[PDB]
Amino acid sequence: PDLGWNQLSKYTIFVEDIMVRDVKFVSASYTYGELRTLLQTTTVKTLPLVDSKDSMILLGSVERSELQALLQRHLCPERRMSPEEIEAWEQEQLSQPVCFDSCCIDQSPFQLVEQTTLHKTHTLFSLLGLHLAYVTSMGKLRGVLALEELQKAIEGHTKS
Amino acid sequence: PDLGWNQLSKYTIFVEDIMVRDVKFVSASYTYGELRTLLQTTTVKTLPLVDSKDSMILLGSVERSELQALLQRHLCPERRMSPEEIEAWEQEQLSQPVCFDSCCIDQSPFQLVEQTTLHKTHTLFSLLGLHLAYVTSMGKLRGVLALEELQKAIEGHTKS
């Protein structure tokens, strides 16, 4: 269900309510403990890459596949084993900062608009097939978007 | 002259060198003196609207037509005349902060990418017909873009 977009009525629509604020992401500052935790937490293929979780400033986008590989390349005991060495190995590695040097990290523009202006910019979101790994508040991870969330809003608007 | 875009060679291309850094704009903080100065300075139809020129943080985009109207609606002596009153009127008004309440001010997304990544994102700039009133560095006016500037870069790349 869609519309494209009919800019024919006096309503405002907030992209901030459309986007998911509960975003799971990886930060450059993570330990292998935190990386594992994230990978266990979410199965989303493309995540935000944050410089520091305490700032939320993005460095780019990153594929889960390589976040997982990076973890495995370090936690595996054979990357050099008694059960004692196996358990120690994983724990020692989990405590270390993550070497995010080889991961599939890349850039992505993002379709973020000024809140209310969805009542016009829906036009673009429909045309561009909205699907983002993130949107940011001037660099800081704000949330994630999909056309599906807007389609629900479009139906609402259309009926209204 | 264009190409669309062939992502077939190991080059980097900087959007920061493509964009014009010498950007004329209007700030919300302007006086009618500054507004007049700007309007005399540039004839570009759509300008950036800056909160304060000392921060460069954008509020939105604004049409020159209404920046001019706003000026005229205040500087004109009849908006109430001896030559003494006429000269005094304009000067008194030029010294005041600008009432940017009724101008054609609106929002615009902008195609800004991470410097070097034009070597891939040229794809988008060509497809989207690049023409912006601004690009910003996380909110701060950074410069302005047009496909024409990229087309020169495309020719360079293509030959290279």
XYZ file of C-alpha atoms in Angstrom:
320
model
C 0.000 0.000 0.000
C 1.377 3.360 -1.096
C 0.275 6.550 -2.788
C 3.289 8.150 -4.104
C 2.318 11.446 -2.569
C -0.527 13.942 -2.797
C 0.504 17.259 -1.200
C -3.137 18.304 -0.831
C -3.842 18.642 2.890
C -2.846 20.705 5.931
C -1.143 18.066 8.047
C 2.310 17.693 9.532
C 4.071 14.347 9.745
C 7.139 13.694 11.924
C 10.030 11.600 10.618
C 11.180 11.387 14.258
C 8.089 9.324 15.122
C 8.471 7.227 11.985
C 12.075 6.209 12.575
C 13.051 3.572 15.045
C 14.865 5.108 17.981
C 15.687 1.698 19.475
C 18.660 1.154 17.205
C 21.276 -1.491 17.691
C 24.683 -0.558 16.328
C 28.370 -1.217 16.606
C 30.866 1.297 17.851
C 34.504 1.597 16.919
C 35.143 1.764 20.672
C 33.716 -1.733 21.285
C 35.488 -4.644 22.870
C 35.108 -8.130 21.430
C 32.766 -8.708 24.399
C 30.584 -5.829 23.210
C 30.887 -6.961 19.581
C 29.748 -10.481 20.471
C 26.915 -9.047 22.567
C 25.739 -6.937 19.632
C 25.907 -9.832 17.197
C 23.901 -11.991 19.601
C 21.445 -9.075 20.086
C 20.681 -8.263 16.429
C 20.599 -10.023 13.094
C 20.203 -6.899 10.965
C 22.572 -7.067 7.988
C 23.740 -3.440 7.895
C 24.399 -1.551 11.103
C 25.533 1.984 11.920
C 29.205 2.301 12.807
C 29.574 4.748 15.702
C 32.840 6.438 16.741
C 31.805 6.313 20.405
C 28.479 5.157 21.841
C 28.712 8.103 24.254
C 28.507 10.584 21.356
C 26.685 8.465 18.753
C 28.652 10.168 15.978
C 28.768 7.981 12.883
C 31.836 6.865 11.001
C 29.767 4.964 8.436
C 27.771 1.763 7.824
C 28.984 -1.784 8.384
C 27.993 -5.303 7.345
C 27.131 -7.762 10.122
C 28.804 -10.537 8.141
C 32.198 -8.960 8.679
C 31.489 -7.873 12.204
C 30.903 -11.573 12.853
C 33.992 -12.627 10.920
C 36.113 -10.135 12.835
C 34.862 -11.573 16.101
C 35.484 -15.200 14.987
C 39.002 -14.465 13.708
C 39.968 -13.439 17.226
C 37.874 -15.588 19.554
C 38.695 -18.902 17.862
C 41.376 -20.798 19.977
C 43.069 -22.091 16.845
C 44.091 -18.613 15.659
C 47.580 -19.187 17.025
C 44.191 -26.255 22.636
C 43.308 -27.584 26.087
C 39.792 -26.681 27.369
C 41.722 -24.492 29.823
C 43.413 -22.650 26.946
C 40.170 -22.507 25.000
C 38.235 -20.834 27.784
C 41.111 -18.515 28.663
C 41.633 -17.599 25.006
C 38.072 -16.506 24.441
C 37.952 -14.483 27.678
C 41.258 -12.743 27.015
C 40.095 -11.813 23.538
C 36.612 -10.657 24.665
C 38.284 -8.137 26.980
C 40.236 -6.508 24.110
C 39.229 -3.515 21.904
C 38.046 -4.562 18.461
C 40.360 -4.360 15.465
C 37.799 -2.838 13.030
C 40.384 -2.541 10.247
C 39.218 -5.126 7.695
C 35.438 -5.060 8.105
C 33.036 -4.214 5.320
C 32.721 -0.596 6.325
C 31.404 1.933 3.846
C 29.504 5.175 3.441
C 25.815 5.817 3.039
C 23.819 9.012 2.530
C 20.594 9.049 4.426
C 17.136 10.397 3.911
C 16.574 12.551 6.967
C 14.213 15.476 6.831
C 13.147 18.270 9.168
C 10.495 16.523 11.227
C 7.177 17.861 9.958
C 8.264 18.152 6.385
C 7.288 14.535 5.668
C 3.948 16.073 4.658
C 5.779 17.048 1.436
C 8.991 14.946 1.425
C 6.975 11.708 1.477
C 7.187 12.333 -2.271
C 10.919 11.626 -2.147
C 10.765 8.804 0.308
C 8.342 6.919 -1.920
C 10.365 7.644 -5.103
C 13.687 6.715 -3.531
C 12.445 3.431 -2.038
C 13.329 4.438 1.548
C 15.495 1.878 3.368
C 18.312 3.141 5.607
C 20.966 1.764 7.971
C 20.624 5.104 9.752
C 19.624 8.693 9.952
C 21.603 11.163 12.044
C 21.070 14.353 13.971
C 23.881 16.313 12.391
C 26.232 13.310 12.641
C 24.717 11.649 15.732
C 22.791 8.426 15.226
C 19.139 9.431 15.566
C 17.357 6.340 14.280
C 16.617 4.052 11.303
C 14.019 4.266 8.506
C 12.022 2.152 6.070
C 9.324 2.932 3.522
C 7.109 0.425 5.321
C 6.859 2.726 8.326
C 5.989 5.597 6.057
C 3.402 3.483 4.220
C 1.508 3.107 7.454
C 1.710 6.910 7.823
C 0.594 7.332 4.194
C -2.503 5.242 4.794
C -3.241 7.317 7.897
C -2.830 10.563 5.942
C -4.828 9.292 2.969
C -7.788 8.378 5.170
C -7.370 11.644 7.066
C 28.719 15.858 -21.157
C 28.064 13.123 -18.611
C 28.566 9.413 -18.125
C 26.161 8.340 -15.587
C 28.851 6.532 -13.674
C 31.300 3.693 -14.241
C 32.730 2.507 -10.900
C 35.679 0.863 -12.656
C 38.828 2.639 -11.477
C 40.908 3.239 -8.345
C 40.475 6.976 -7.914
C 39.138 9.181 -5.154
C 37.132 12.315 -5.858
C 36.445 15.029 -3.260
C 33.021 16.661 -3.026
C 34.735 19.352 -0.920
C 36.737 20.473 -3.968
C 33.679 20.254 -6.200
C 31.427 22.443 -4.076
C 31.716 26.174 -4.010
C 33.031 27.346 -0.667
C 32.510 31.016 -1.558
C 28.826 30.944 -0.714
C 26.661 33.980 -0.295
C 23.767 33.491 2.096
C 21.353 35.252 4.371
C 21.340 34.887 8.109
C 18.404 35.195 10.451
C 20.645 37.520 12.474
C 20.955 40.050 9.621
C 20.026 43.690 9.726
C 18.229 45.293 6.798
C 21.649 46.804 5.993
C 23.112 43.302 5.740
C 20.053 42.049 3.839
C 20.361 44.850 1.281
C 24.099 44.199 1.000
C 23.460 40.519 0.296
C 20.791 41.248 -2.288
C 23.124 43.692 -4.033
C 25.941 41.088 -3.796
C 24.142 38.058 -5.279
C 21.351 37.331 -7.709
C 21.067 33.619 -6.945
C 17.399 32.663 -6.573
C 17.658 30.271 -3.617
C 20.024 30.999 -0.758
C 20.909 29.213 2.478
C 19.222 30.612 5.571
C 21.726 30.651 8.440
C 20.820 31.004 12.136
C 24.005 32.990 12.785
C 26.830 33.712 10.344
C 29.238 33.052 13.229
C 28.102 29.410 13.436
C 26.849 28.868 9.870
C 24.145 26.527 11.168
C 21.262 26.320 8.712
C 17.615 26.935 9.432
C 16.615 26.180 5.840
C 16.534 27.584 2.286
C 15.067 30.911 1.217
C 13.938 32.595 -1.998
C 15.694 35.828 -2.981
C 12.392 37.192 -4.269
C 11.020 37.366 -0.749
C 14.260 38.469 0.801
C 13.984 41.423 -1.576
C 10.305 41.967 -0.824
C 10.998 41.909 2.903
C 13.653 44.563 2.456
C 11.386 46.765 0.268
C 8.418 46.507 2.651
C 10.539 48.153 5.326
C 12.881 50.516 3.496
C 10.175 52.199 1.405
C 9.325 55.679 2.962
C 5.654 55.260 2.127
C 5.204 52.278 4.462
C 3.701 54.570 7.079
C 7.696 62.163 2.685
C 10.273 64.958 2.632
C 13.732 64.006 1.237
C 14.833 64.440 4.862
C 12.281 61.852 6.011
C 13.091 59.604 3.076
C 16.792 59.459 3.835
C 16.218 59.133 7.575
C 13.610 56.412 7.047
C 15.873 54.194 5.007
C 18.807 54.608 7.416
C 16.708 53.911 10.498
C 15.330 50.783 8.879
C 18.736 49.561 7.598
C 20.007 49.588 11.188
C 17.226 47.240 12.393
C 17.248 43.395 12.624
C 15.315 41.745 9.815
C 11.781 40.487 10.364
C 12.219 37.128 8.540
C 8.684 36.009 9.418
C 6.898 36.039 6.047
C 9.673 35.104 3.622
C 9.561 32.083 1.364
C 11.550 29.913 3.717
C 11.446 26.154 3.346
C 13.379 22.941 3.815
C 15.703 21.117 1.479
C 17.611 17.847 1.813
C 21.048 17.992 0.341
C 23.354 15.648 -1.454
C 26.491 15.722 0.656
C 28.817 12.767 0.721
C 31.975 11.783 2.582
C 34.616 13.520 0.498
C 36.303 10.771 -1.502
C 33.197 8.733 -1.981
C 32.253 10.688 -5.116
C 34.194 7.940 -6.911
C 31.051 5.829 -6.322
C 28.314 8.342 -5.358
C 28.697 10.167 -8.686
C 26.141 7.514 -9.640
C 23.576 9.231 -7.423
C 24.537 12.750 -8.260
C 24.007 12.081 -11.955
C 20.690 10.235 -11.368
C 19.334 12.865 -8.999
C 20.199 15.822 -11.248
C 22.414 17.499 -8.615
C 21.496 21.138 -7.932
C 21.590 22.394 -4.332
C 21.084 25.631 -2.384
C 23.547 24.126 0.089
C 25.416 21.289 1.631
C 26.316 21.311 5.317
C 28.961 19.948 7.624
C 26.613 18.389 10.134
C 24.349 21.468 10.060
C 26.990 24.103 9.226
C 26.931 25.608 5.750
C 29.855 23.973 3.951
C 29.199 24.955 0.346
C 26.929 24.637 -2.717
C 26.747 22.018 -5.496
C 25.725 21.519 -9.116
C 25.952 18.600 -11.526
C 27.898 20.874 -13.864
C 30.840 20.903 -11.469
C 30.692 17.152 -11.242
C 30.473 16.836 -15.034
C 33.846 18.492 -15.303
C 35.110 15.958 -12.729
C 33.444 13.129 -14.682
C 35.259 14.109 -17.854
C 38.519 14.218 -15.896
C 37.865 10.761 -14.429
C 36.724 9.315 -17.754
C 39.914 10.428 -19.492
C 41.938 9.275 -16.491
